[PDB]
Ligand SMILES: [Ca+2]
Ligand SMILES: [Ca+2]
């Protein structure tokens with residue numbers, strides 16, 4: 001039976017001078033064993049939910065800073081980098097953004113003069129959101145996820161309310177506004193998932209190149225990295241990192257977890273004790289290879305952030321229950337649901353270098 005995460009060598013120290021090791025957190029996890037785990041193993045942090053647009057400005061001019069501030073205060077106290085998730089997103093965004101001064105839905109507007117008015121009103125609202133946030137946190141944040149999931153899985157830009165109302169300008173303006181209030185040393189990222197899929201990678205590459213050629217201040221690309229034990233391939237991961245490095249962009253892994261399952265995640269285990277040890281071994285093998293890659297590419301990667309700390313709190317539990325009639329569990333980390341280390345931990349902390 002394995003030792004507890006507080007009883008073993010630090011992950012962040014293992015990867016000193018290669019990349020920071022981060023976790024996504026909620027304010028209420030900043031106590032007890034999870035706080036202990038954070039200090040011991042991570043040197044970087046991101047708010048799982050406290051800094052998303054809906055959390056911070058749920059109605060116009062009503063600002064909810066308290067939870068965000070707590071994460072910032074803990075990062076200050078314990079010398080952790082802080083990434084900001086997220087300034088602009090089609091999801092988890094208040095609907096008040098997309099309603100005009102008459103109470104009408106901007107997406108439904110038909111007359112051109114009013115569509116242009118709506119685009120300017122929406123960009124002003126977006127710019128004000130970003131200005132207030134960045135002015136408040138600019139000295140505490142070291143990477144900004146400026147826009148999140150702007151590329152569609154079937155080829156284009158995502159046809160969200162932002163896109164339908166502003167076209168591509170909400171992206172140009174979010175970056176220019178972040179740069180303006182954040183200063184030159186703010187690092188501005190575009191974040192997305194399935195960046196390893198050739199066709200999505202290319203669409204992001206095209207967007208970003210095009211934005212860079214227009215002088216839009218993009219410093220890096222964020223790779224959410226919601227992966228599985230058998231997908232995506234190391235080769236495809238490698239190709240993705242290198243394509244963006246070729247534009248002179250930093251890469252960060254922003255939301256790493258490795259599901260035990262495929263897609264859709266049926267049929268999930270309903271108990272942690274039901275998970276076979278061969279599956280955990282496979283997870284360890286894959287993490288080893290993944291972190292060997294990261295290391296191969298560490299000049300191109302500034303930060304690797306897991307989307308949580310230990311298996312007892314993961315959005316992947318929700319997603320298992322969503323696809324399995326409300327029951328089901330996932331175990332995507334190197335620390336288990338009781339905070340004990342898993343086979344994956346030993347395989348990413350180790351100094352093995354014999355290749356495979
Ligand atoms: Ca750092
Ligand atoms: Ca690095």
Ligand SMILES: [Ca+2]
Pocket residue numbers: 311312313314317329330331332337
């Ligand atoms: Ca779990």
Ligand SMILES: [Ca+2]
Pocket residue numbers: 288291292347348349350351352
């Ligand atoms: Ca290893």
Ligand SMILES: [Cu+2]
Pocket residue numbers: 288289292352354355356
């Ligand atoms: Cu190995």
